[PDB]
Design a protein around this motif. Structure first.
Motif, short mmCIF file in Angstrom:
data_model
loop_
_atom_site.label_atom_id
_atom_site.label_comp_id
_atom_site.label_asym_id
_atom_site.label_seq_id
_atom_site.Cartn_x
_atom_site.Cartn_y
_atom_site.Cartn_z
N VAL A 281 5.13 12.32 -1.90
CA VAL A 281 4.29 11.60 -2.84
C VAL A 281 4.38 10.11 -2.54
N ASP A 282 3.26 9.41 -2.71
CA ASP A 282 3.23 7.97 -2.53
C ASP A 282 2.15 7.38 -3.42
N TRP A 283 2.30 6.10 -3.74
CA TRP A 283 1.35 5.39 -4.58
C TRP A 283 0.61 4.35 -3.74
N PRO A 284 -0.39 4.76 -2.97
CA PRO A 284 -1.07 3.79 -2.09
C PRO A 284 -1.68 2.61 -2.84
N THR A 285 -2.18 2.84 -4.05
CA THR A 285 -2.80 1.78 -4.85
C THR A 285 -2.30 1.87 -6.28
N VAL A 286 -2.39 0.74 -6.98
CA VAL A 286 -1.89 0.63 -8.35
C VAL A 286 -2.75 1.47 -9.29
N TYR B 298 9.19 10.88 -9.16
CA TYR B 298 9.53 10.49 -7.80
C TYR B 298 9.59 8.98 -7.60
N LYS B 299 9.17 8.19 -8.59
CA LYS B 299 9.07 6.75 -8.39
C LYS B 299 10.42 6.13 -8.06
N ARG C 21 3.28 -2.88 -10.08
CA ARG C 21 3.57 -1.57 -9.51
C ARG C 21 4.79 -0.91 -10.13
N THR D 121 0.81 -1.21 0.00
CA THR D 121 0.00 0.00 0.00
C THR D 121 0.85 1.27 0.00
N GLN D 122 1.72 1.42 0.99
CA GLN D 122 2.48 2.65 1.17
C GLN D 122 3.79 2.59 0.41
N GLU D 123 4.21 3.74 -0.10
CA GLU D 123 5.47 3.86 -0.83
C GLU D 123 6.38 4.94 -0.27
N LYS D 124 5.83 6.07 0.16
CA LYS D 124 6.60 7.16 0.76
C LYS D 124 7.85 7.46 -0.06
N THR D 125 7.63 7.88 -1.30
CA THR D 125 8.76 8.18 -2.18
C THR D 125 9.65 9.28 -1.60
#
Lengths: 196, 245, 32, 305, 272, 32, 32, 136
Positions: free
Chosen positions: E114-119, E80-81, B209, B108-112
């Protein structure tokens, strides 16, 4: 500076005095190296630029080898701002027959927000009109303050203390995006204010 | 001139010292502690401390861990106290891999994170044991400083450090961590992640992802063996390393 | 059922009641 | 190579274009917020930024103690004009919608959209010698407007490479041709046709104006093909008149061409082959016969790389 | 008409525009189902919509954040990925109503997180300039080193003459090697940074742990460094007065205090 | 009704919304 | 719907679950 | 086979065992509906089931507690009803799958607190050795 007080502590019959020569280097942009200091200390001696420094040479005490702690009063505010003072006509406020050279709090906040040495932000991000009006009002009210920086705390704490002292709000304008300052004063017309 | 003591020995004495607290020597995993002591001695990483705060063991242990960069946890399986060092001393192949089809449920979390923020200058303050006088060193960040339109600086105190070079090494490690832009993931795993322990690095892959094989270190652990059957782990990107120069 | 009405309720309604509950019980919540 | 941006005032454009030139390796003998004395391996030039206009002038030597319009071998004093005026590019004050800059090691081309539908070109560089042995070839051009509100493209107006104009004070563009008819090497020939000066130059600048003096005006008019909607570029041939009205072809404008915008919108791309081209209107979009209030359908073509 | 439409009880057609700018590159997005042209700028329509949570102005940077929601394939957030871009992405938010050419500025700030919580979704936390006041402001120490970044406004040292442009010979996981730098003494580039062009007029920069012979140790790994792209490398200043003067001859601007006094008080116990 | 859906909802769903509410209101909750 | 069961639930039921959630997550809530 | 069963997608038969030990006296309980023999030890089946809330390892003793739920008549917890036993009741938790003789140790600790919230249920808070480091 010729400081003449050889008998301040009673001289020989007492504990000595303060006699000597004092040299002050404020640290201007173009300040040069003092030949005497470098010659006395020797080695790789820089210009000590950017910081106020003093060089004392002479009698400190007598009879007993325990020198006493000193206290020095110093006024500041003009040597700041790097090289471009902002609205200098109202930078300082005079109190008590000119004895106290207080500084306008608005100038303090402007320096903190835009001062290169402290944080440094572009001067284009500040709403000039609001800050100038606040400075004019404070100068007219003769509301000056003095402070010293030794807490080494976040800018937020100092800014909050200043705001509480003057009673003003600093917010980033949502529309134009610049920093705006509003004073809490009864300087409004009833009619022009919006009604809801 | 300076007879520094290995921090691992300090922690072992605190955990097992009869005078301080006193715990059975049988409850400590000898292998892990011996390996940590050997590594620290090889790295020449010693520290000096004095006890006058009269505080809880937890505070002193946390200070020591932050100084050395290690995690102390009670092993879930064998029950003994284990110590793991955060160093790039791992082989890519042997580390376990987790995938959507290999034991990963959902991430769920990524926190780039961001890089425009974060310091450009770091000040480290240490005490020299030869004379006991306060000393400091400066670790600089030229690139991020150029990025920063306004200068920034922070002060960190490492009074445990007795030499300037060691303080510089740890400060470089801290700057490395704080300005490399870590990515923090909060993944959900099935039973395949049952044997993991805090500080254990492992690989994760999730093609949908767009995340390639990445090395992450385990953080907070919450698992539910009976009932929901949900094993959820919090992990961080592997960016911990103590340079020797 | 327990998705849109159980969690999204925090949007603007379930805040005041939680705050008054907090000001009701302080010593029992303030630590642990 | 290709750059885009926005500038609220001309000074911002100055800063950005100078930054790009320096990053590309251009040598600036002296730099300032509003005055420039730069050069390259081909020739020397000087520019000044006014309140709402540019002042450009060619150069041959450098002297830091002389004004922007007093450099050695300056155009102001080495031109047939009795007015002795330098090149001028008239602009507006305030927002510039967007500016498009083409940068190379030998020439700079700029196209600024001061406002919606308003465009002001600035051209500088050296003509492709094309194996022709001659000293000089440096050309500096500017954009001039006669009067807002009235006909913008009046006869008195002057345009880059213009082949017909009426004005006694300033010139829109100019060219260097050293040692013409045995004269002194420093010679800065302006683009004039009605002065009857023994030495002068002419160009297709205005495009397809009624009284434009250039044999390719028909080519510019017919650049667009109705049958297949294909457009072809036309190199801008420059001609120089000798002491006794004897013309000598000098060269062509590098990486430049003209065409008709009848069937192309501003910025419309027509990639013809491995090299791509950008087409923009000269002043503003209008109709075929609007030669007074706008620039008709004349379009400037630049090669983008 | 924007204000008139806002006061209107029947013409309300809200539409929020976002503009992400980084130097010479701008990204435009809109929350409607069709593109909007404003100030000669066309805002793309994201297939799935872009929406925020609201604007809060309470005087606290920690609490007055701005949150943006967008799908997984957003171009601006995609940078940012792998690694956060070196420069900050300024964000400006406009408000306009369909059919009107006038818009009002609502929020101005930069990307905070920034974050990607879901696809299929993203969450971007935008921070205002006010949060940048939480860090300390001391920035002053009486130590022996320079206490200044090489090239900062205090050092007043021009690094353009020291700029070195080169094409790397070989790139590894952690080390970038080039033979041109092999001609400099060991540690010459220590403390410097490498800047190279990513797109337009924006450069991404990395650091140098240590310079030894022909091998350069890059902080954080060499990921994202092009294998053949042009790289610009600047030196680094150790900060010592000897180093400052011998190499850069900037001793007059030296901000450090080498041998002025380390301990000496005038209210001690025994001067001898 | 108010037993399994009102309290057990905290299991894994009502936490994120409460956390965002907390980061929304800080000065009004941080004290009392 | 979201009025009597979403907020009044705090009366005597939703307190214990919130307290156990608090004792579950401390470092992540204690600051901000 | 324990690890293989855990990785298995169709043989999952989780069963959690608890072992409360105090010197020479051991109490064995299981969460299934029938007794399990493991290492020559038989675990009694409580009529009503024994279940926990999960294992948390976050590095904080205050937060990483372990909670056990059992009926009111549990023998091991009944000692605390009048006065807490002087010695600490060590607790060891095993994990095994029905039909397999192999088990894995999951949690080790001692009784931290016990209470009888209802006349038909109990809640036992088990603490790990890490909490003993908070005192001066």
């Amino acid at each position: 500076v010729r400081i003449n007080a050889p008998e301040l502590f009673g001289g020989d019959k007492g504990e000595g005095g303060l006699d000597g020569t004092l040299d002050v280097l404020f640290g201007e942009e173009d300040q040069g190296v003092l030949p005497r200091l470098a010659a006395m200390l020797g080695g790789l001696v820089p210009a000590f630029r950017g910081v106020t420094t003093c060089f004392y040479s002479g009698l400190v005490t007598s009879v007993n080898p325990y020198p006493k702690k000193w206290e020095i009063l110093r006024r500041g505010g003009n040597r700041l701002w790097d090289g471009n003072p902002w609205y200098p006509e109202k930078q300082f406020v005079w109190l008590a027959d000119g004895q106290i050279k207080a500084m306008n709090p608005a100038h303090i906040l402007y320096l903190v927000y835009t001062g290169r040495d402290f944080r440094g932000l572009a001067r284009t991000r500040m709403d000039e009109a609001s800050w100038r009006a606040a400075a004019d009002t404070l100068y007219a009210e003769g509301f000056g303050l003095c402070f010293e920086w030794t807490r080494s705390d976040s800018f937020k704490n100092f800014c909050e203390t200043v705001k509480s002292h003057i009673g003003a709000e600093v917010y980033p304008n949502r529309q134009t995006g610049q920093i705006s300052i509003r004073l809490l004063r009864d300087d409004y017309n009833v009619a022009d204010l919006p009604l809801f | 001139q300076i007879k520094a003591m290995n921090p691992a020995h300090i922690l072992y004495l605190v955990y097992t010292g009869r005078d301080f607290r006193g715990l059975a020597r049988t409850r400590m995993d000898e292998a892990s502690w011996r390996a940590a002591a050997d590594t620290l001695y090889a790295e020449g990483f010693g520290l000096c401390f004095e006890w006058t705060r009269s505080d809880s063991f937890k505070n002193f242990c946390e200070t020591v861990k932050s100084h050395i960069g290690a995690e102390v946890y009670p092993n879930r399986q064998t029950g003994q106290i284990s110590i793991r060092l955060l160093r790039d001393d791992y082989n890519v192949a042997d580390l376990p891999l987790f995938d959507e089809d290999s034991g990963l449920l959902e991430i769920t979390q990524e926190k780039t994170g961001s890089t425009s923020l974060a310091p450009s200058q770091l000040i480290v303050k240490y005490i020299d044991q030869i004379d006991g006088a306060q000393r400091q060193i400066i670790v600089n960040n030229n690139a991020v400083a150029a990025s920063q339109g306004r200068r920034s600086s922070e002060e960190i105190e490492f009074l445990g450090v007795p030499t300037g070079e060691l303080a510089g090494r740890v400060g470089e490690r801290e700057m490395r961590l704080k300005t490399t832009g870590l990515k923090r993931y909060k993944g959900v795993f099935d039973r395949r992640a049952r044997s993991l322990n805090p500080g254990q690095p492992f690989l994760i892959r999730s093609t949908p992802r767009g995340i390639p094989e990445t090395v992450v270190r385990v953080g907070r652990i919450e698992d539910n063996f009976l009932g929901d059957g949900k094993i959820t782990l919090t992990v961080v990107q592997d960016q911990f390393n103590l340079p020797a120069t | 059922d327990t998705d849109q009405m159980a969690a999204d309720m925090w949007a603007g309604k379930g805040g005041e009641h939680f705050l008054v509950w907090l000001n009701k019980n302080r010593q029992a919540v303030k630590q642990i | 190579a290709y750059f885009t941006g926005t500038a609220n005032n001309p000074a911002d454009l100055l800063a950005k274009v100078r930054v790009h030139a320096e990053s590309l390796g251009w040598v600036t003998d002296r730099a300032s917020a509003s005055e420039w004395l730069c050069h390259n391996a081909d020739g020397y030039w000087s520019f000044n930024a006014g309140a709402n206009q540019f002042q450009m002038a060619g150069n041959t030597g450098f002297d830091n103690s002389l004004a922007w319009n007093a450099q050695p071998g300056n155009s102001v004093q080495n031109n047939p004009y009795s007015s002795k005026g330098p090149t001028v590019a008239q602009l507006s004050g305030g927002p510039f919608t967007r500016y498009h800059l083409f940068a190379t090691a030998a020439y700079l081309h700029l196209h600024v959209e001061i406002a919606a539908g308003q465009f002001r070109p600035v051209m500088i560089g050296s003509l492709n010698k094309r194996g022709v042995g001659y000293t000089g070839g440096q050309y500096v051009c500017g954009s001039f407007i006669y009067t807002p509100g009235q006909a913008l493209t009046n006869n008195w107006s002057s345009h880059p490479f213009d082949g017909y104009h009426i004005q006694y004070s300033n010139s829109s563009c100019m060219l260097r041709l050293d040692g013409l008819d045995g004269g002194p090497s420093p010679e800065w020939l302006p683009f004039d046709y009605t002065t009857n000066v023994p030495r002068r130059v002419v160009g297709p600048g205005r495009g397809n104006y009624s009284s434009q003096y250039h044999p390719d005006v028909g080519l510019i008019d017919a650049s667009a093909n109705e049958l297949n909607s294909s457009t072809t570029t036309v190199p801008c041939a420059i001609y120089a008149f000798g002491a006794q009205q004897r013309s000598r072809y000098v060269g062509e404008v590098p990486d430049f061409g003209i065409c008709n915008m009848a069937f192309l919108a501003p910025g419309d791309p027509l990639v013809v082959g491995s090299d791509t081209w950008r087409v923009y209107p000269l002043l503003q979009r209008g109709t075929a016969t609007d030669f007074d209030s706008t620039s008709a359908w004349v379009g400037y073509c630049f090669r983008v790389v | 008409s924007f204000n008139s439409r806002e006061s209107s009880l029947a013409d309300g057609q809200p539409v929020r525009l976002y503009q992400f700018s980084r130097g010479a590159i701008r990204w435009s997005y809109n929350s409607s189902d069709r593109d909007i042209t404003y100030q000669n700028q066309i805002f793309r329509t994201v297939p799935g919509g872009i929406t925020d949570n609201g604007i809060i102005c309470s005087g606290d940077p920690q609490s007055d954040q701005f949150v943006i929601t967008a799908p997984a394939d957003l171009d601006v957030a995609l940078l940012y990925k792998t690694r956060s871009p070196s420069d900050a992405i300024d964000l400006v938010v406009y408000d306009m109503h369909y059919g009107d050419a006038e818009a009002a500025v609502s929020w101005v700030g930069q990307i905070g997180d920034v974050d990607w919580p879901t696809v299929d979704s993203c969450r971007i936390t935008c921070v205002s300039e006010d949060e940048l006041m939480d860090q300390p402001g001391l920035t002053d120490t009486y130590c022996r080193t320079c206490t200044a970044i090489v090239g900062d406004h205090r050092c007043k040292v021009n690094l353009v003459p020291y700029r070195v442009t080169l094409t790397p010979q070989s790139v590894s996981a952690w080390v970038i090697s080039s033979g041109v730098v092999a001609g400099y003494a060991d540690g010459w580039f220590t403390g410097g940074y490498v800047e190279w062009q990513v797109d337009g007029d924006n450069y991404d920069r990395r650091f140098i742990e240590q310079h030894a012979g022909a091998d350069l140790h890059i902080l954080g790994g060499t990921e994202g460094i092009p294998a053949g792209g042009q790289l610009r490398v600047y030196p680094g200043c150790d900060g010592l007065a000897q180093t400052c003067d011998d190499k850069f001859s900037n001793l007059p601007n030296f901000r450090g205090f080498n041998a002025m006094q380390g301990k000496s008080p005038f209210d001690g116990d025994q001067v001898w």
